[PDB]
Every structure is written in structure tokens, then in C-alpha cells.
Design a protein around this ligand. Structure first.
Ligand SMILES: Nc1ncnc2[nH]cnc12
Ligand SMILES: Nc1ncnc2[nH]cnc12
Ligand SMILES: Nc1ncnc2[nH]cnc12
Ligand SMILES: Nc1ncnc2[nH]cnc12
Ligand SMILES: [Ca+2]
Ligand SMILES: [Ca+2]
Ligand SMILES: [Ca+2]
Ligand SMILES: [Ca+2]
Ligand SMILES: [Mn+2]
Ligand SMILES: [Mn+2]
Ligand SMILES: [Mn+2]
Ligand SMILES: [Mn+2]
Lengths: 236, 236, 236, 236
């Protein structure tokens, strides 16, 4: 059912479904098998930042994930998202654990969409969360996601003693639909930034965090924990 | 039930409920009887712009409505909106006709809310509509409001032949709730701008347009057409 | 001397120096011979909008020029501007006439540069001119450029009777240097938008308008009127 | 000569020139004797944030200074800055030490000015420094001010061993002039935010930090160290 465009921060190589044999960032267009990936060194317990950038002019969905020591991974993929997404969408963040686990803590998330037509006629949506609240009424939380008093978005279950749990899936979508393209726009652009804290005591962290764009009514697909990152009903 | 803070562009003097005896802009806090007004020369058939500005520092809700020839009216009112509004709100635009009538056409609407805490931790919501679409999924339309193909928001009924109808009420609220204050914010500010086209063939235009802030579940009060501008169940 | 990156709106095909045999938009990196062009139908006397977009992630300089009837031309070019430009620059607008002529009237110009590092540490510059004033102290006007009372930037000479003159060159650069890249930035992006009105009574319009980025001390090169668009000392 | 509007973070009570007998924030219009002040508990060695807000609608210059534990001081003052400032200005930050001393370290500074006319015609300037660089070409440094490799703006002299020096004055002004009012603007607003770190080993910290607005050619007045905060030739 859902149509998904996602940038995944994939901490666990599932080499039997396309993953390269390392942690990676990837651009996912309607499939968990990334159309493009790049090797990503996830820094356990460090606060990372992902930036996702698209414009309809260059038609390049780009993402960069960095940590404070400056190591970064970038992935870009040429794609015309007008042909992929419906005109109205919701944007959100998703994360998973499976057999292995990790905290999928989002510390901030910002997003901007703009449709520039002809002629000083722009429609724009911008939000920025640097602090999430307990009762975050402009966010739709799905599955295991929760917003804490500590001001974070915990996309997957973390135990009272601070421990990430396995087989968790959770997503947070901005409440308002976004008009991410409009056929008379000369420029439809968006950008998204989030900061995250992936920490694991496990033998390996898993499974990752994705920023995604979906149909407005998108919900977690059945059994999308683990390697499917809460975005896809399957690994096709 | 609803809690309303509004800036009204009031085209019709209802002198028996507080209006001054002229068209006016006013600041309405939980009552249609404006706490403060200023004489406003509505320019029939011209495109006006209203700007509404509040910050929690100066605690002054300010509004200015202007037309291209530069005539403008300003109203300011000292008020602590933390004590008025709930923490989460919806923001919107409302307009009415009663016995007299006018087009209450909104050509653009923009809004920004920011909560600045301590410490480069800001939450922000910004939207901008310069063109409304027919199926405007990030707007909640109430009552007679409609968004047209022409890219406008018609808050009240306009006849197929372009004529405004009487006894109309309509509102458009942004879909996402807004967090307009948060007690640990050092600055909670917002601003709103809209452009409007009030045209009437009537002996007098009525009744006006308001930008308002309300509880998230706000709906048009019963019999709020006319002088109550779709905001208030009564003239108290 | 100068280093120039430019998006040109080139109204005159100078086929002996690389131009294609039509009006075109092009991306110029250190040469007037565009690395990339696209056919552009200049609409005489209509107000056009150009949008220029770059990010250091996708490393794609993109431009689109459109008119209100929606005809548009787009050009994109993969390039790493960190390797082209100095770290600090000035940004501006340039236009020329030669043997043929045209008004090169800019009605608005906006620009944003951002350097996003690690870690909610962004440097940003944004300006927007929708109205230029006579004494525009945040603009550096070179050559024939002038800002009028009418609120426009006339990059090339227009006669008192409204007529564009030949052999004119003029540029307007934003006063403050811009830091358009910084090697520790994870994202260095910029965007620029301007609206323009190219009108000509001539047998052909010429020569065009460019948005450019240059070294801070950039000045009009000698004999850069006409086909060199006020950017290049020569056609190499 | 200079015309100064300033918000001062005044760490040292100079009770013989108007200061109240405590550290205070104040709004200074053409005089170091603040038109309005508020008691401010400066938290030695903590990172503070000041927010300064003005709009020409409400005509209230407002400032709030806060620290992460949430203690804050606010000051507001009704004033029409169109009658005070010239139309074009420079904006900057100033700080002083005298007999007592303190670090006057600025960690970030952001500013926005907007002139909204009639009719989707806004001029705007926004800058944001979250990191200052050594060679900060869009800043004018005066007196003792320096930008470090550490990414801070040290408005006053700090010794190689980290110690603030006495009798220091330094200012940083944004390079481009700002058009802070224009008589046909319906709204002329600005806001400024900076974060600062005032640390002192002294028996008392002194003298403070100001954000100011001045004539474009403003320079440090002779003998404006200490209680005059680098803004005023005297205490009148
Ligand atoms: N370790 C793994 N490699 C490939 N595909 C998988 N699916 C689940 N676990 C996997
Ligand atoms: N003309 C009017 N004056 C005062 N109050 C009113 N209520 C309805 N019409 C009115
Ligand atoms: N018409 C033209 N074609 C090619 N190059 C030129 N240089 C000057 N005019 C020219
Ligand atoms: N301590 C102080 N009190 C008042 N004015 C002053 N000027 C210099 N030092 C002072
Ligand atoms: Ca995986
Ligand atoms: Ca009324
Ligand atoms: Ca040419
Ligand atoms: Ca003092
Ligand atoms: Mn993957
Ligand atoms: Mn009224
Ligand atoms: Mn060319
Ligand atoms: Mn003082």
C-alpha cells in the first residue's frame, strides 16, 4: 500500500536483502533495497546529524550523516520524486531494532518544504523540533515511538534502566500533510535535518533510523521491525 | 467552550456590542468586544494585508492592516497570552457576513511560531500559503470556507456569479496544532500575515475577517455569522 | 584575475564563442563558455524568475528560469564549488548589452548561504530585496547599474525615455562578503532567486543577465560589455 | 557623533551614572543611562543568551537574557526607533572592561531585519554566526575584538593564559549596512540573538556586553572602555 521515499541510516548489514556488508546510509525509493548507499561508520553513543536535501530542479536526493569529529558519509541519487510520491505526503522519522538493538533517539528534527511557482508566490512548510515534549500534539507517534520529558524522541523502546529493546519499531510523522510537489511549481524542494543518538551495548547495533516521506495515511507495515526499518512490508 | 484570541478586521460597526462607530481593526481576547480597536478604512475591492505580531517578551499583541496606497491602521494591546491560551492551539482565519455581505477572500496567509528555550534549542512552525489549492490537505475548512482553483481561500460563500452571500461564516485553520507557549521558553513569539480582498456591492460591507488562535478542537460556534465573525457564541 | 561562477540568462546566441544557436540559460564556471546550457525562450517584456540552487552534498549547481505562463528552462551541472571558488566571495547580479540591447531590470533578488557544521552550529546569510532603493547601501553597484525610485535594479543603462542602451555593463553585488564554503562544513548550500524584466525593441535582445559568485574584490572586467556579460575579460 | 540604540548586559553597577545598584539589562537610547533596566543576575562562567526584539507596530524594544538554569531578566521599552535611528545602520556587539574585568566572549550571534511594505514585497537581512572564524570577512572588528580559532568572538582582550584584561573595549559590527526602517514600510522589525560567556576571576565582573545599532560609520568612542561599554563618548 504505502509509497515510501526514505533516507536510511542503516546500522546493520543485512547482506541477503541488498545491504552492503557494512553500516551504510542509503536512499530508498519504494524499496528497502537502497538505490544508492554509502559506507557509514556509526559512532556508538555519539550524536549524529543527518541532512537530507532534494530539489526538483537538480532532481537529486542527497543525504549526509556526520558526527562531531567530522567523519561523514554522503549519498546522492538522481530521481524525480514527482514521479514517485503523491502530491501530498507526510514526512517522518522511523527506526527499528530486531535481533540486535540500539537506542534510536532523535534529539532534533527540522524540515522545510517549499513550492515556488510563478510569479513571489511560494508555499512553504517549515518545522523545527529541538526539544520534543511529552504530549507532542503536532507529531503522530506510531508503534513504539515516544517523546520523553528529557526532550527527546525515542523512536524505539528503551527500557526503564536506559536499555534499548529488540524487535521494536516506531515512527513519528509530522501531523500536517505536506504538499511536496505541485505540477505548476517551478521549484519543489525540501530539506530535513535530524540529530540522533544511536547507542548499543549489543554485539552489533541494529537496525537504524530513516527519515521518510510517505502517503498521508502511512502506518507501520506489519512485521517491519528489524531490517525493514518500519517502512516496508517486505524486502522486495 | 472555545478560547479565542483574535485580530479582527471588522468592516461593520455593531455599536450595540462594543464596536466603535466605524470600520475597525481590533484585538479580541476571549470576547468579540475588542480590548482595543483602531479606526480602519476598509478599501472596497482592494487587496489588503494584515500583519499580526506577538512576543512573550514585550507581551504586546500588535496588528497592522494596510492597503497598497499605504493607508494603514494599527492596533496594539498589552496582554500575556500565556495566561489566555492553552499551550497548544490551532491558528486560523475566520470571516463572516450577516445582513450585509462582502467577499472575504484570502489571497495568502503565513504564520510563524517559535519557542526559544535555553540553551540554540528552538521549536518553530512556519507556514506560508501564497496559493491555496482545491484540496488543501493542511488546512481545516469550516463552515462556508472553500479553497478555489483560482488559488484563493474564500472564507465565506460567494455566488457562482462572483457575488458574496449574506449569513455566511467560514474558517480555515492550519491542520497541525501549534505549541504557542511553553513555560520554559524564554521567548514564545508568533507572527501571522495574510492578504485579503474584501469587496462588496452592498449598502455597507459586513462583517469582517479575523485571524484567530483557539483551542485545537475549536469549531464555529452556533449562530456566529455576522457580527460574531465566526469566533464567539455571543457578544459578551 | 577574478574567479567567476555564474548562471547566465543569455538572450543572444554568440555561436562563435560556444553559445548554442538560441537564447539559453547556462552554468558558467570560470568561463563564459557555459559548461552546460539549456534552450531558453526569453519572453520579451515579461517578468521572469530565475532560481539558482547549489548544495555541497549533491554538488549540483542548478538553475531554472520561468515566466508566469509557466514556460521554463532548467540547467544543472555537477560541480564541486569548493574547488572552484574561494572560501569567501561576493554574490551579485550582472548584465550586458552590446550591439543589441535590452533592459536588464531586476525587480527582486534574494539569496541564502548556509554553512552547517557539526554539531546545531550553522552560519547563514540571507538577504532579500523586493524593492531596491535609490541609495542602496548594502549593494555595490558597478558600471552602469543603478537602483531607481521605482524600486528596481537597472543593471544596464536605460534612457530617460525608457529605452535600453547598447554597450552597457552593470553589476550589483551584495555588500557583505559571503562565506560560501568552509572545509569543516558538512553542508554548504546556497540559493538565489531573482526576478527580472528583459524588454527590447531591438531586432534581437542582447546580451543577458547573470547571477554570479566571485572573489570579494571582483570588479567588471575591461571590455566585458556584450557577450561577456560583465563577468569575463575574454571568451576563453 | 554616533547615534546609538543598545541593549546592554551591564555586569557592573556604576551608581553615579544611572545604573541601578545591581547587575542589570537595560535599553539605551542615545545614552548610557538606560531608559529602562531590569535586575540581571549574571552567572559567572555560564553561557547566557540574549534575545532582542523590536517591531515598528508595537514600537516596543524588548530584551530578555537567560541562562540554562532558566533564570532570566527581561526589559521592554516603548520607543519609536524611526525617530531615533537613521534609516541605514550597522548592527553590532560591543563589550568593555575597566578597572574590573570579565571575558566578553560571544559564542553566537544572529540578526534579522525585515521591512514589509505594501504589497508580498519584503526586504530582509538575516545572518547567523554560530561559529566565528579567524578571518571573519563579514564582520567589522573594532578595538580589542577578535575572532578566534575556537569559533568565538572575543569582544575584549583575553590574555594568552585565558585571563580577561582590564580597560578593554571591542566591538563587532556586521559588514553590510542594514536598512532598519523605511518610511513606506508597514512593518520594520528586527531581532537579534546572541550567546555569550561572561567569566571573571575579579572581585567583581565588569563591564558588560551590548548589542547595538548605530550609524553605518560608527566607531568606538574615545575612552569608552569601562562603564560606557564602547558605545558612548560620555555618561550623559
Ligand atoms: N544478517 C542478515 N544478513 C542478511 N539478511 C538478513 N535478514 C535478517 N538478518 C540478516
Ligand atoms: N447595526 C448594529 N449595531 C449594533 N449592534 C448590532 N447587532 C446587529 N446589528 C447591529
Ligand atoms: N553574432 C555572434 N556570433 C558569435 N560570436 C559573436 N561575438 C560577437 N557577436 C557574435
Ligand atoms: N563604582 C562606580 N559607581 C558609579 N559610577 C562609576 N564610574 C566609575 N566607577 C563607578
Ligand atoms: Ca540493514
Ligand atoms: Ca462588527
Ligand atoms: Ca551570448
Ligand atoms: Ca555599568
Ligand atoms: Mn540498508
Ligand atoms: Mn469589532
Ligand atoms: Mn552563453
Ligand atoms: Mn547600565
Amino acid at each position: 500500500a504505502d509509497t515510501i521515499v526514505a533516507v536510511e541510516l542503516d546500522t546493520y548489514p543485512n547482506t541477503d536483502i541488498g545491504d552492503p556488508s557494512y553500516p551504510h546510509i542509503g536512499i530508498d525509493i519504494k524499496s528497502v533495497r537502497s538505490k544508492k548507499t554509502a559506507k557509514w561508520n556509526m559512532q556508538n553513543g555519539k550524536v549524529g546529524t543527518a541532512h537530507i536535501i532534494y530539489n526538483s530542479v537538480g532532481k537529486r536526493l542527497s543525504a549526509v550523516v556526520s558526527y562531531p569529529n567530522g567523519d561523514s558519509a554522503t549519498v546522492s541519487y538522481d530521481v524525480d520524486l514527482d514521479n514517485v510520491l503523491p502530491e501530498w505526503v507526510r514526512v517522518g522519522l522511523s527506526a527499528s531494532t530486531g535481533l540486535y538493538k540500539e537506542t534510536n533517539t532523535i534529539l532534533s528534527w527540522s524540515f522545510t518544504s517549499k513550492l515556488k511557482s510563478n510569479s513571489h508566490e511560494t508555499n512553504a512548510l517549515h518545522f523545527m523540533f529541538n526539544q520534543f515534549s511529552k504530549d507532542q500534539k503536532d507529531l503522530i507517534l506510531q508503534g513504539d515511538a515516544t517523546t520523553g520529558t528529557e526532550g527527546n524522541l525515542r523512536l524505539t523502546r528503551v527500557s526503564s534502566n536506559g536499555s534499548p529493546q529488540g524487535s521494536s519499531v516506531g515512527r513519528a510523522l509530522f501531523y500536517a500533510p505536506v504538499h511536496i510537489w505541485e505540477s505548476s511549481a517551478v521549484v519543489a524542494s525540501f530539506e530535513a535535518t535530524f540529530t540522533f543518538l544511536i547507542k548499543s551495548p549489543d554485539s552489533h547495533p541494529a537496525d537504524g533510523i530513516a527519515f521518510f516521506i510517505s502517503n498521508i495515511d502511512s502506518s507501520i507495515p506489519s512485521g517491519s521491525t528489524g531490517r525493514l526499518l518500519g517502512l516496508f512490508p517486505d524486502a522486495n
